[model samples]
Target: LGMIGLGRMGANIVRRLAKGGHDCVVYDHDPDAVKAMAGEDRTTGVASLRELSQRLSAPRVVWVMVPAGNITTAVIEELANTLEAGDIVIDGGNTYYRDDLRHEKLLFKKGIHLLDCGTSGGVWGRERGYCLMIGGDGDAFARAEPIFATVAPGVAAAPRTPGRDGEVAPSEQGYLHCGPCGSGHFVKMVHNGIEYGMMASLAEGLNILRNADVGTRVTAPLPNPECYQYDFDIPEVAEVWRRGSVIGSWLLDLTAIALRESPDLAEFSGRVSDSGEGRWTAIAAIDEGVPAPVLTTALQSRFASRDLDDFANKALSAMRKQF
Candidate 1:
């Protein structure tokens, strides 16, 4: 197997595979990342894309772990030229499914297999394994099973809701062959869209508590103002909810961590960046003619955080002042 891109997440993927007794030839534009990974067991580092291609045998499996869009396109194109028919290329990046659809069409013409894998669990995912949402050729997916098992979190990632399960499926093992090319990333797109809603709700709920002390003051009219009098400690509140509360989720765990580290959260400038998925999710909802206000509003909130709504807000204030 060959791995290109040795950033934090990429580096971890190599380590996880190596530790699982898989041999990998790694490369990065930055030689230092390659050198450090090469020092690990069952891992070798190459300097160039051509060298990486040559290092692997026929019907090679190459996983590209880079930022989506331009960088991913460049790597895939380079591989398409170098790799032979029956070779498998996995794009383990946050790429758009539409792009995957286009790439698969191109790669299929040359007999190259394109598996667009939506790899979740973040940069620190090596410790917990990754949830690989895969979409590609059936034969290519079968050939990549061992590598997927080694990379995924396995059956222990979660317990079956009911104990009537027989053999654990690939999904329970933290990976799945979702469908034809583009479907995997489409699923992931929805996942991140839901992620935005979950994150905003948890953070927004906590901040509501931060304003609870407002009830102690007499600044504005209130119907049932007595409810807000409590002074809630944001960290402790989240900590308690994490134990048995329904809303206490994996997202809340990180939320609790940040609040504990800095209750004031003074370091952040309040600008949230939406990395294309959220907007795509909204577009998908509209295309399908489904109501997705929760996810779309969450994405909209992110835009507002970036001050994209400044002009509209100012216009509303102008109307209020004129009245």
Candidate 2:
């Protein structure tokens, strides 16, 4: 197996794969990262992608872990040229799903297998394991299962094949092999779209709770008054919600933990940097005719976050007691 790119996530993935007893030929644009991986830190470094491709076994599987967009495209195109027919390429980045489809066609013409995977886990992926949504051939999927098992939490098999009970039902278990080429990425895009709406809802609700006032002139700054007065360190209301609450989720847990770390809310810029996935989700939705209202709302929220104008207040002024 080949591990390309040695950024934080890629480096950690290499560690996990190496610890799982998988021999990985790692490469990175940064010589420092390559040296670090080759050093006593428990990772084997490669000199180049071409060398890595040549060294790997037949039906080669090269996993790309670089930033999405042109960088990923360029690397794959280069690999496709150097690698022989029947080799497999896995792009494990936040890439646009449609790009997956395009590459799939191009690579298929070359008799190469392309698996565009949408992987989620973040900095804590090593500990909690990575969540993978893969698209392409079943043989390739089965062949790569070992690597997936190595990286994912032992609780379940990265929920491969789309739905429940190892069945390909489109109802639940978010992960799915949608179709040939870029289906994996397409599903991942939708999943991320849902994530956006959920985040926006959570943010708006928190703002409301933070600004809510009680009784006459006094403002109720605390989410829970009793907990506030007693100064009990027994987790915040959000934490409480995380425990046995229907609204509980990974994002909620993260938010609670973040709040605990910084009660005053640390300084953050209004601008949220997007890596093209959200826009891809919207474009995919338009292309597929899927109703992704929540995802759209989330993208809109990010736009609004960057904008300094008080649009809502302005709208209210325009309405002016019309009811």
Candidate 3:
């Protein structure tokens, strides 16, 4: 495995892959980080992208785990120039799906297979395994199957909890070869877009509870202090509800954990980062005439969070209001 950009996620991935018995040629800008993971044995750390490219075997597979946008583009361009034809470049970063299509077309002329992959699992990826979504040539996808299976938590083998006997279960959301080229990234973009809506809904609900005058009524204290005379808090109620509630998800669990860690809640920067996929989904929705209200709201919320004076407010003022 040719691994580039060994940050937390990258380092963890290399560690996991290394432990899984994959000989990884890893590279990063950080000398200390490179030294830490590469050690004396096991992994090799290269000086530059060209040097890294040279070290890899033929029909090379390099996974770029970097911050999305310009940096990703630059690295891919360099890799495209440095590597020979028929080599595979898998971008595991959260890039816009549209960019994936553009890159695929650009690389096709040179006979290089460029895949746009969506990887999820955050800090726990090394331990829990990442949810992998990949898009590219059928042959390239087949070649990378071993790597994908290693990364993905047995989404394939989980007891066939039948959704409708033959129907695919949601948790058993198996990775698709999707279609040729950018399909994987496009699906990933929409996945992120959907995530935005779900996150916003959760955030909004929490905010409403926090802002409510008689929040104790809705987010009631556990053990019913009025009747049972036991010490309890609103979070206890929230926790109990989360146990079996349909809304119970990893995100909610994270939120609950966050609240437990710091009751006041950590001060989040209003300058929300756009990982690109969400915006790409918005653009695609517009172009395709898809009514993605939830996704659109999520994108707008990020804009609103970042730039306090987004034009959406202005449009709201000028536009007709039915209510």
Best by lDDT: 1
What's the TM-score of every candidate structure?
0.94, 0.80, 0.82
TM-score: the better of candidates 2 and 3: 3
Q: Write the per-residue lDDT of candidate 3 for residues 82-112, one digit (tens) a residue.
A: 8888888888887777778777776776777
Give lDDT per model, in order: 0.85, 0.73, 0.75
Better of 1 and 2 by TM-score: 1
Q: What is the lDDT of residue 161 in candidate 2?
A: 44
Candidate 1 similarity to native, TM-score = 0.94
Q: Rank the models by TM-score, top first.
A: 1, 3, 2
Off by over 4 Å in 3: 30-32, 38-41, 156-159, 163-174, 214-234, 269-271, 310-323
Q: Which candidate should be chosen as best, given TM-score against the real structure?
A: 1
Q: Which pairs clash inside model 2?
A: 162-176
lDDT of candidate 1 over 1-323, digit per residue (tens): 88888877777888899988889988887775565553657887877889888766887889988888888888887888888778889888889998887787777777788898988887658889988899988889999988999899988777775965687889888899999999889988999999999988887887788888776876348767787798878889889998976996888888788889998888898999988988899999999999999999999999999999999999999999998
Estimate the Cα RMSD of every predicted model relative to the unseen true structure: 1.8, 5.6, 5.9
